[PDB]
């Protein structure tokens, strides 16, 4: 049932990506802006069987699409999502400017920032915790080096194509 995943209305923020447990309709379509697979060929997917098929979905900025790949680096890859170096699956993305774009800005979707340690492959950190700081306790923001660990996107109806929102879903196969 891929329709539940590729046609849902509510999506999750990148710091709290959603996981699901489970082809010609996919690779014959032309709406998808990006379509890349690692370790396997899309045309050969009908000739194999697997026990597990996971689907992960979230929304990110258009400029950050390149970060969803094995061996990449950046804020999203370091603190929000991370693929192994021997990943096996596909990455799908398409423009979503007609949705998730309100006059004045959405400020609904968030992304983590100022984390202290890089994430391990396939893990999520969702709880808003005490603010990142130095050697001094912090319970607010006054702390000139104290910062709230989350930030919000500023999606608006008019912006550069690089700043428009994109919906992305990642498929994983394992037996």
């Amino acid at each position, epitope marked *: 049932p891929f329709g539940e995943v590729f046609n849902a209305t509510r999506f999750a923020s990148v710091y709290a990506w959603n996981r699901k447990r489970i082809y010609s309709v996919l*690779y014959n379509s032309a709406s*998808f802006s990006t*379509f*890349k*697979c*690692y*370790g*396997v*060929s*899309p*045309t*050969k997917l009908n000739d194999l069987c697997f026990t597990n098929v996971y689907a992960d979905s979230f929304v990110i900025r258009g*400029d*950050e699409v*390149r*970060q969803i*790949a*094995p*061996g*990449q680096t*950046g804020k999203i890859a370091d603190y929000n999502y991370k693929l192994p*170096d*021997d*990943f096996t699956g596909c990455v799908i993305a398409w423009n979503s400017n007609n949705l998730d774009s309100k006059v004045g800005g959405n400020y609904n979707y968030l992304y983590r920032l100022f984390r202290k340690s890089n994430l391990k492959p396939f893990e999520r950190d969702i709880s808003t915790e005490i603010y990142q700081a130095g050697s001094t306790p912090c319970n607010g923001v006054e702390g000139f080096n104290c910062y709230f660990p989350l930030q919000s996107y500023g999606f608006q109806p008019t912006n*550069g194509v*690089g700043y428009q929102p994109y919906r992305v879903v990642v498929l994983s196969f394992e037996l």
Partner: antibody
Amino acid sequence: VQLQQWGPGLVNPSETLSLTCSVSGGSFATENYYWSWIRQHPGEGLEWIGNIYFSGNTYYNPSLNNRFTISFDTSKNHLSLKLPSVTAADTAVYYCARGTIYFDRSGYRRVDPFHIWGQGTMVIVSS
Amino acid sequence: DIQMTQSPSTLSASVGDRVTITCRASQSISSWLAWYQQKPGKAPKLLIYDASSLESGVPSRFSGSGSGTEFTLTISSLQPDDFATYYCQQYNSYSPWTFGQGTKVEIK
């Protein structure tokens, strides 16, 4: 990830050159990546030596007279460059890089340009 | 097999000016071309790929376009950090990969 290089700084005008490149925080054993060697003569453009893929396949530069050699070392997870019988024209900087391989929607196989580079190594031919 | 040609060999400009560079190929290539920048005594870095795709983390003032046998790299507004050497490289699947001659930019 970081790449480190090891090599001799001086070499006699007719001897064997040996370089080594490595990685930290990862591993070479992966069918997703490929490696190459680049060199640059002093005050000149860049030159491409060749490529090595997972499973040991290789692809060299025809302009060069197949003097070079590229190989893995699974006992240490290193990659090395070999050049025997060096001459005066072998003084340059040498780089090791990495890339990525993926499949297209139509089913073809594509490649990405280099995106990780080493610090380089300088070698001089003594006498 | 395949060959390139860069022009101009040397170029002079000033902060805030417009700069254009052209990379030409001997035979048609299906947009498999990239651009690199190199500072003195440092390893290069990637700016453009596929002749039109921008790299992650590079400023938006860089742009490129073209296909087949003519390509161009354009800088909208020169900054003090944009004075360096630039190279064009192609990674076609039917021929060995090769680099360009390089072009240099300096302050007027």
